[PDB]
C-alpha cells in the first residue's frame, strides 16, 4: 500500500534522525524496496527514472547522508569503486567474475568466530600487535556456471 | 634464491590444500613466478620446454587443479579465449581502522577449505549454479593495539 510504503519509509528516516523530505521518502524507498549494490551514477539513474526534476546534486547528498547514518552501507570493491549496499545486516559476498553481478551470501555464526579467532591470532604471531574491535569481510570471486 | 623459489612455492600449495609433488613445484614456479596470461597451449609449451618428460596429461591434470584450487586465475574472454592469470593474491589482510595501514596474513588450509565449502554450496543452493575457479578474500578490520 502507498500509505504502507510512505510510513515505513518515514520510520527508516526518523530512526536515523534524517529530517523527513518527499525526495527523502522516495529514496528510502527505491532504494530499500530490494537487496542491491549500485554505484552512485546506478543510484541517480534509479531515483531520475522516477523522479525526473530532482537534480544530480540533491540525489547525491542524500545518498551520502544515507551512508553517514547508515541506512545504506558503503561497500568498496577491489578497483576503488564504492557501491551503496541496501542490506545493512552483517553479510558478505561472492562476486561473478563472468559478469560482475554480486550475491549478499552469509557464514554461520560459529565458524565465523573461528576465522575471526585463527586470523586475529595470526595477527597478533606476524606483528606482535593484537587488533581490537575486530569486523569480518569476505568476498567470494569466481565463474558462475551456467 | 632456489631457495626461497621452492619455498615460495610451497606454501602456495599448502595454503590451496595441493598435495606437494617435484612437478607441482616445477608448474608454481613457472607459472606463478611472474605476472603473466596464458592459454592452455602456451602453458604446456612452458612447462614442456623445461619439463621435457612430463606428459601433456599430467601438466593438463595440475593445470586443471591449480585452477580449481584458485592459485591461478581464469580469464575468460568474451571471444571464447580462456587465459590462465597469475596474478593472484595467496594471503588475506588485516587493516589498522585508525591508521588505514595494511598487514598481510594467513588462514589455516583446512578452515580455509571450510569456508569456501561452505559458501560454495549456499551460493549453489540459492542460485541453482556452481562458483567455480574460487579465491576467498578476507579482510580484518579493527583497532592496532599497541
Ligand atoms: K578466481
Ligand atoms: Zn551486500
Ligand atoms: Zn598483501
Same mark, same amino acid.
Given at each position: ?9 518515514? #520510520? ?11 525526495? =527523502? ?5 527505491? $532504494? *530499500?524496496?530490494?537487496?542491491?549494490? *549500485? ?15 530532482? /537534480? =544530480? ?7 551520502? $547522508?544515507?551512508?553517514?547514518? &547508515? ?6 570493491? #577491489?578497483? &576503488? ?25 552469509? *557464514?554461520?555464526? #560459529? ?5 575471526? /579467532?585463527? $586470523?586475529?591470532?595470526?595477527?597478533? *604471531?606476524?606483528? &606482535? ?11 567470494? #570471486? ?5
Amino acid at each position: 500500500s502507498m500509505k504502507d510504503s510512505y510510513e515505513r519509509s518515514k #520510520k527508516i528516516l526518523e530512526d536515523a534522525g534524517i529530517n523527513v523530505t518527499v525526495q =527523502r521518502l522516495q529514496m528510502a524507498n527505491l $532504494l *530499500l524496496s530490494k537487496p542491491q549494490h *549500485l554505484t552512485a551514477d546506478q543510484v541517480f539513474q534509479l531515483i531520475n527514472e522516477h523522479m525526473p526534476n530532482a /537534480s =544530480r546534486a540533491t540525489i547525491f547528498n542524500n545518498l551520502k $547522508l544515507f551512508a553517514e547514518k &547508515g541506512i545504506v552501507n558503503l561497500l568498496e570493491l #577491489k578497483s &576503488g569503486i564504492t557501491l551503496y549496499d541496501s542490506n545493512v545486516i552483517h553479510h558478505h559476498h561472492a562476486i561473478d567474475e563472468k559478469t560482475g553481478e554480486i550475491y549478499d551470501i552469509s *557464514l554461520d555464526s #560459529k565458524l565465523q568466530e573461528k576465522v575471526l /579467532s585463527e $586470523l586475529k591470532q595470526d595477527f597478533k *604471531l606476524k606483528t &606482535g600487535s593484537s587488533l581490537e574491535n575486530c569486523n569480518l569481510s569476505i568476498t567470494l #570471486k569466481g565463474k558462475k556456471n551456467p
